[PDB]
Design a protein around this ligand. Structure first.
Ligand SMILES: CO[C@@H]1[C@@H](n2cc(-c3ccc(Cl)c(F)c3F)nn2)[C@@H](O)[C@@H](CO)O[C@@H]1Cc1cn(C2(CF)COC2)nn1
Ligand SMILES: [Cl-]
Length: 138
């Protein structure tokens, strides 16, 4: 186990068939979790479970370019529970990131940042106990 915030290097960026697995436990009274796939200061893919946005649970996904947040893609299907162990898997495909949580498909996010081989860091932050963060090629 690791203390957040944690930054997982992605040397030479990401490539299709790369499967990034984040294991942890959601804190009791969790408010937010964030994964930030970064290309330098740009956030190619921000994955942001929010546990109480206007008393609703929502997944917010977005890209940050030149320090500006773009168009949010939102999803009400919310597989996380306060206090429970989770597995987030981000599978890099040619045209999108595919996200599955606890072995159930959650969402796809089309590549806005095109230079996959420059998405060289993954930041992990928010209301989790981080167990591990790793990747393999499928
Ligand atoms: C509150 O800041 C949010 C941003 N955010 C979260 C964290 C964050 C830090 C620390 C921790 Cl531990 C975490 F879990 C975290 F999520 N940092 N920045 C990010 O979630 C963004 C996504 O779109 O939304 C917000 C910012 C935002 C959104 N917008 C619009 C365009 F998108 C929506 O109408 C205009 N303009 N600004
Ligand atoms: Cl944090």
């Amino acid at each position: 186990p690791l203390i957040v915030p944690y930054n997982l290097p992605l040397p030479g960026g990401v490539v299709p068939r790369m499967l990034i697995t984040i294991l942890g436990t959601v804190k009791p009274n969790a408010n937010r979790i964030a994964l930030d796939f970064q290309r330098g200061n740009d956030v190619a893919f921000h994955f942001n479970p929010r546990f109480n946005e206007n008393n609703r649970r929502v997944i917010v996904c977005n890209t940050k370019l030149d320090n500006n947040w773009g168009r949010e893609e939102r999803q009400s299907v919310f597989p996380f529970e306060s206090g429970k162990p989770f597995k987030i898997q981000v599978l890099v495909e040619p045209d999108h990131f595919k996200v599955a949580v606890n072995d159930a498909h959650l969402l796809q996010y089309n590549h806005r940042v095109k230079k996959l081989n420059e998405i060289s860091k993954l930041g992990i932050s928010g209301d989790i106990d981080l167990t591990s963060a790793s990747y393999t090629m499928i």
